[PDB]
Each structure stands twice: as C-alpha cells, then as structure tokens.
Design a protein around this nucleic acid. Sequence first.
RNA 1: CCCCGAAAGCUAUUUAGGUAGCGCCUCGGACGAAUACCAUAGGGGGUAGAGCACUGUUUCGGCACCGAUGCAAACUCCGAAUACCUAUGAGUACUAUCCGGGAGACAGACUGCGGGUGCUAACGUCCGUAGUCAAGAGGAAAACAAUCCAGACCGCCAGCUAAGGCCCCAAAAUCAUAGUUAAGUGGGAAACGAUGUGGGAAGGCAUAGACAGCUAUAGUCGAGUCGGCCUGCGCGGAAGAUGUAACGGG
Lengths: 97, 38, 58, 77, 142, 137
Amino acid sequence: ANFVLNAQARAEDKQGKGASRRLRRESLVPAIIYGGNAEPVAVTLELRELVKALESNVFFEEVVEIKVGDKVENVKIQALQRHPAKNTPMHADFKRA
Amino acid sequence: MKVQASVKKICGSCKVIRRNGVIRVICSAEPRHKQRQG
Amino acid sequence: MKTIKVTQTKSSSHRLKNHKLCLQGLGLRRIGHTVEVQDTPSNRGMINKVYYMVSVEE
Amino acid sequence: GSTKNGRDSNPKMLGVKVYGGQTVTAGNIIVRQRGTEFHAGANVGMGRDHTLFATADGVVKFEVKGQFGRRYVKVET
Amino acid sequence: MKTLSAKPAEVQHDWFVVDATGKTLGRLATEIARRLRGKHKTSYTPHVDTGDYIIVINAEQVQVTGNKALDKKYYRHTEFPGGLKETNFEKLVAHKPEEIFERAVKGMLPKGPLGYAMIKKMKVYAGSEHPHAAQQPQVLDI
Amino acid sequence: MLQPKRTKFRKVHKGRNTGLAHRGSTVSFGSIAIKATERGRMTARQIEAARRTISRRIKRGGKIFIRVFPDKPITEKPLEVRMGNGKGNVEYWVCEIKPGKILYEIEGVNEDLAREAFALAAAKLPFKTTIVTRTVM
RNA sequence: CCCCGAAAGCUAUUUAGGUAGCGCCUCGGACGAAUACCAUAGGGGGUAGAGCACUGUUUCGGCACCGAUGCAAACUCCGAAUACCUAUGAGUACUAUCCGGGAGACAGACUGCGGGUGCUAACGUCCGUAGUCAAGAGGAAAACAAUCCAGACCGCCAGCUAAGGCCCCAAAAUCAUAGUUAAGUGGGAAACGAUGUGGGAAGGCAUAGACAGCUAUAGUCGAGUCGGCCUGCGCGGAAGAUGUAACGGG
Ligand SMILES: [Zn+2]
C-alpha cells in the first residue's frame, strides 16, 4: 500500500559484473527476491525510486509491493549494499512476506 | 585592501562582485573589509 | 564438415610466443592472408586466443 | 656502521615430484617433504627423511581420508 | 618524361583586386596564399611560380574576433642586448596595415627564394584606390 | 601521540595502498561521523591535532570516538648519507587510509555543532572528507 | 658475393674490465614426429582477495573473562584467476633427441606489470616477468636508440591500407548532424575560494497576494521566487634571469 516499487526482469545476459556495471551506469539497481514456495527472482529497480523509499523509516518495517509486469510480489527489505565512499545503493535483497 | 586567495563575506554589509575577471569583496560601512583576488 | 574463413588483419612481429604459434597452427603467414579451416573446438581455441588480430567469416 | 643481517641457507628443492594420474615404477620418489604433509597408503613407503616412494608399479592417486582428515598418497596396480 | 613541368616563360599572371572590408584576416590570408602559390591551376609545379597578382584595398578595415584586437602582440628584436620591442594589433593596424598583411601571408608562404619572389605579387593599400589601373585587375570575391 | 606499546618487528616493508574500505565505513559508536573519500596516509600528530580541534570546539559536551590508530612504522635515513649500509631508523608512525574509512564519530552533541567542528577538523587533514550519520540500513 | 645467426646469464676462481664447465650460435653425421600450438580429462598448492579460529597488536563498554570494532612480509578458520605436471585427440609446422668439428660471449639499456631499497625522489639501485634497442632501415610523435604502426632480395612516374591526419607552410573535408566553451581555456601546475554557464532529482512558498524596495504588523506594487544536493565545461591561486620562447609556425 505505502510502497509499490516498479521492477523489470533481469535475465542471464543481464547478470554478471559487466552487466551490473552497465546497469548502474544506466542508473538501475539489480536486486534479488528470495522466499519460500518459490525459487529466487532477479529483477532491476530504479535508483530514484529506491533512494526515495530508503529515506522513509516505515519502509523497513512495512510490507512492500514489487510489480513486474502483471505479477506482484509482497516482500520486505532484507539487505542493502552501499558504496563505501559515494554511499549510493548498489544491490538489494528482498524476502517474501 | 587585502589581496588573498580566499576572500569571504565577513558581515551583512559586504558584497561579492566580479569586475573584469577579478573577484572582489566590497563593504558599505567598513572601508577595511575590501578584499581582492581568489 | 563445415569450414570457416580466417584472415589476418594485424602484424604479429611483437606479439606473445603462444599467439604467434597459434597463427602458425592455423596456417596464417602474413597480413591479409586468408585460410580455410575446419570448424572444431581445437581450431576455435586458437582463433579465440588471437581474436584481436583476425577476422572470421562463417 | 654496519648491518648484523645478511645470511641465508642454500635451497633444498622440496615438493611434489609425480602428480596424480601419472605412471610410476617401483622406487620412484613421489614427494619430498620436511614433515609428513602427506602420508603413505598402499604400495607407498616412507624413508628416514619423510620422503614418500613407490614400492610397486602403477598409477599414483591422492586422497583425503580418516578422522584426522590428513592427506594420503597411494599407488594403484 | 610523360609528366611535364610548367615552363616559366609560358606562365601567364592574371591580376585581381580584393576588398578587405569586414573579412577575417586568417581566412582571407589562406586564400591569398593559395592564389599566390598557384595551387588553383592544373599546371601547378612546386619549383615554378604559377600564381596571380593580388591587389588588396581597404586593408585597414580587416577584422579579428574575440579580444585579439587588444591582446594579439607583434614582437621584433634588434640584435642589441635587451632590444625587444612590442606592439599590438590595434596600434599596428592603425599605423601600418601593410605590415599586418605581409606578416600574415609570409607566415603561410614557403621560405626561400621562390617564396620571396612569390610574395612580391601582392600589393596592399590602406585606401580605396590603387595605382595599378593600367594592368586592368578584375574583382575577385574571397 | 598514539604508538603501539609493543611490536614483533621494528621495521616493515613499504607495501602498496589499493582497494576500498568495505570494513569500518559504518557508523557504529555514535551519531555523526567524518569519513575520508580518497586514500592516503594519516600521521599520529595529524590525528592528535584534529582531535584537539574537535574537542576544543565542542567544549567537551559529548563523546568523541577515534577509529584510526597508527600501527605502521616509517623509517628515514638520517641525512648526508650515501645509499646502502642497511635500512634506516624509525622516526614516526602512520595509519593507512582507504576511501570510505571512518575517522571520527561524535555522540551526544547537536548536528550543527558537530558538523561545524568537523569542518574545522577537515582543514588539517591531507585528504578530502565527508559527513555521514547513523542509518537503519 | 651467397646462407644462418648470438650473448652480456648460472656456477667457481688472490676473483670482480681475465679465465674454465654449463646455457645461447654455426657445420657434418645419425635419427625421424618420439616435438610444438589448441581442445578435453586427471593433479598439488597457500599468492591476489578476505578473516580473526592460533601469534601479536588497537578502541569503546559490562564483569584474567564477556559484547562490539579495526590491523599484520616473517598471523591463517579460508581461498582464486594465471602458471606448472601427466594422458588422449583434429589441423598446421622436416619439429624433438643423440654423436662429433668451430665459435663468440660471461660492462647491458629503456619501457609496462609484481616488489625490496630510497623520500611511493632520481635518465638512481637490486630481483622476477614481457616487448624494443643492442645487431633493424621505412611512416607518426616539430627536432627525439629503448614509445605507436611496421620487419628493407632488386627495378616501376601503377593500385589498397596501418599508426596518424584532411585552413596555409605541407598530401587529403573551410564535409554533415546535435550540443558545450568566451577562458586563445584549447596550447604547464595543488590545497583552497567564489561566482559564470549546461544537464538531473528533491524540497519551502505563492494574485484569500510570497520575494527586493518605498511609505504607515499593514499596503497603495503584481507571479514567480528563497535556499540547498549530484554532475559537463570554464575562473583566481600562478615569481627569474639572452630574445616572443608552456599550439613547430602563420
Ligand atoms: Zn563588511
């Protein structure tokens, strides 16, 4: 309800160090969703949306809806990786709620 | 006039301008706050 | 058995010894020279090792 | 002044001499080691200086075995 | 010998007059140098002079861009110690525009006897009138 | 002047400073922290000067946490000496700083005073700095 | 006149600019794929990185211990890519090994990568590894052994290209499209300062009238404007002696 992050599909050709660096140059953040009853799903998110969500404190406790096409996944933010110096978000781990 | 690489505003009566490529600080009330260059 | 054309595009004078030997094993002998070789993993390895100075026509 | 260092010992050329999958003959040395980094299995003997040698003709094989988890070298005929 | 060189005796030099009002000095000087050297003729020979006579009028109206009018410096050294003399574009154009054009063109012309001979075919005058009516120059827009 | 109480070896190799600081980049002992953004070397006297400036300007109204300690000795030949004849003697101690390394944290003081004090401290350091705060994730 | 073609290393020496054995060159005989490149299969590791389980070291707390946090060539619970060894195989290369006749050489240099020493100085010095010079011309970098491109059997007033370039000196576009700069920046130089100008995201306020000023919180004024963050290109900081001399010149 509060947060609906719009995600895309991140495939094998888009996985890897080179693909990740290209995506971050295009201002996109790779992310993974892992939870019970299904295998992990790799997705891509928008840096501006992720940064806006991260500011709010309730983002960490409330459930979030990740929309990829018609599919909607209800998850909670599990982990975040930040650049040591610049502090920009780089990767996110979500756990199904 | 003080000539220095770091010229900054001192009080509320100061103003920073650029004359012919030179940065200057001019103060209305105080004639000693005049700064040049930097 | 399919075949592939391979043309040498740059010089080999100051390259690594294994790269020169890969050229020799493929049969290239000078700039602009083109050869026809069998399409096998053994030849593909040599081609990939010297990709930067060859052109492959499939 | 001067320096009190500047000494070193001659090399001893230690290490493995025959690798796994290779063929050996009886008497061939397989491992030169200061201690028992590797232990002997079937058809492998140990010398006074902890050297491991082959007592039979065959193929060398390395493995990890035992509660201790120590490494063994053996020869398969 | 199937390729032939131009014969100096057979060369013909044509006269043209150019007006410098409002034009840019360097972009005019390049074309003047081309025509003086004769790069525009199919009979061009490096060791022969096949160019044309170029008169320049209103030379003191030549223009430069930016702040070059004030900041472009012309130097010259008398061989005496400490004898370096300096001037700038505005004063030099006011006093001797002929020198301005001479410097601009000699810089772009070859250095040697042939270059010295080639630069003689340029006549520069500050006014709108020239004394070469007898040669019947034609108007050239460059 | 921070210096290790004891050491196994008196003299160490020069080495090379590369990589980023994935450890020590998180505020963990206070509220507001100053963090380096490039790499370099920080000396004990520089550490002491920065700490003294910060403490003086905050007027001992909060707690300062120091997260840099100099443990790498540095040697220099005395003077007027030719090359050779062994390594030199120790003259001072330093700490390697990688980008992202946190240098000082402050707890118990207000953001304005802490930031202004960090601004004073930055004028003494030999590398660029930035200001960070505690965060959830 | 024709063919091939090195080395400046290891070991020892009253030895250090000498010499001897080995390594590198050449010729003859014997012997021939037993060789090399690549693919697949099998095999050991303790380096890069990382970590605190041993050794040592560091800070903050609660009772020599416990919680948190950081470091290491001579620390390791861990651990690559490469490199090295063995077997099988396609293709392409007279390869690999042995016996003998003749040598030269044992003062190297620069550059890139991993390091010790030095000041993370030296066209400095000492190792490993690859390229060039040495013993190699041609084109480019103005001039410039060691950089880039490229390996000169002889002749041609024929053509296509590499590095690098197309306004003139001087061969080739004053070519085409969309932007940035105003400093001749381009075409030397930092911490730091402040305004220039382009792009991006966010936030405060507003004709129930903000913002700069002027008049007694008001309003005779009529719509934008106040303050910040991330980025492209520019500005100051910038002093030396022979003569412009820090785009080769115009
Ligand atoms: Zn003032």
